[PDB]
């Protein structure tokens, strides 16, 4: 007998996409080969993002992509996102962008192309930059989800600002005892 613990032997991580999308599986095959047969760590990151779930591949708005592309030294670089690129109607000027995405919204696609931009899929990105040279790997806001407002410390604990689960919002719904000093306590 040996003195070890076996509760952490099996690392919990995606070794493949749980999706049955045959097109996603094809470009997983392409980037499984690229990650193995190159020393590019860019291919390793892209490959493991391809396995990720939809909640782990948040959409990237056009405004956020433009703002990251406008940073110094990123001219003539390809914006790579492993997910959906989304139109942001809050912006009025779209510059010229070279973009690779898993998926682009129709309105966002029209805006990028009309501004002289270029849109690539991940198969075309492999031919353009097999090692991912001259690319900016972007990601949508991972915690930009309603669930994360409810996560954290319990709402009925001091110094916790987490949203409780309520069927309705109003003066009659969970605004009394434990929420104000007049009604017992507040914390």
């Amino acid at each position: 007998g040996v003195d070890i613990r076996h509760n952490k032997d099996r690392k919990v991580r995606r070794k493949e996409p749980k999706s049955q999308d045959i097109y996603l599986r094809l470009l997983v095959k392409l980037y499984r080969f690229l990650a193995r047969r190159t020393n590019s760590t860019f291919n390793q990151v892209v490959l493991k993002r391809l396995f990720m779930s939809r909640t782990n591949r948040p959409p990237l708005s056009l405004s956020r992509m433009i703002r990251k592309m406008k940073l110094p030294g990123r001219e003539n670089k390809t914006a790579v996102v492993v997910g959906t690129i989304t139109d942001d109607v809050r912006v009025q000027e779209v510059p010229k962008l070279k973009v690779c995405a898993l998926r682009v919204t129709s309105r966002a696609r029209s805006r990028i192309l009309r501004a002289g931009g270029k849109i690539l899929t991940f198969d075309q990105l492999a031919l353009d930059s097999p090692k991912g040279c001259g690319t900016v790997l972007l990601s949508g806001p991972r915690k930009g989800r309603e669930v994360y407002r409810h996560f954290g410390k319990a709402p009925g604990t001091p110094h916790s600002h987490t949203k409780p689960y309520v069927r309705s919002k109003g003066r009659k719904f969970e605004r009394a005892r434990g929420r104000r000093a007049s009604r017992g306590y507040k914390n």
Binding site: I22, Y23, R25, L26, K29
Partner: protein
């Protein structure tokens, strides 16, 4: 595309046989008759198949031409070889190797031709 069509029929096909911990594929131009991307006789732009002749002697070497991929009526060119075994294998070797027409199927077609010819010669007592 061959890779895309493979992802559709790798597990869902009328030619698929899955029995006794084994898997076989019964499409017309499958050498070795195995379910595999390399040996699938439907998904590739160029394929080679070896079948016994219509009568009980010789082999039929069918290749897939490159032009009418969506026109199955004229997509396959069938030739019949009815000579001695050594000469028959040489013709199949030259068709595959000299033309550079799917060289990865050279020995599979040659072995299948040998099996067909070996089955055509009369049994003994």
């Amino acid at each position: 595309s061959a890779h895309l069509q493979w992802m559709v029929v790798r597990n869902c096909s009328s030619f698929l046989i899955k029995r006794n911990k084994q898997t076989y594929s019964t499409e017309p131009n499958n050498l070795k008759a195995r379910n595999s991307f390399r040996y699938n006789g439907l998904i590739h732009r160029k394929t080679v198949g070896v079948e016994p002749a219509a009568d009980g002697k010789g082999v039929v070497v069918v290749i897939k031409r490159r032009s009418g991929q969506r026109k199955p009526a004229t997509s396959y060119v069938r030739t019949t070889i009815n000579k001695n075994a050594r000469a028959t294998l040489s013709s199949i070797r030259h068709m595959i190797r000299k033309n550079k027409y799917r060289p990865d199927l050279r020995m599979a077609a040659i072995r299948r031709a040998s099996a067909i010819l070996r089955s055509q010669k009369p049994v003994m007592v």
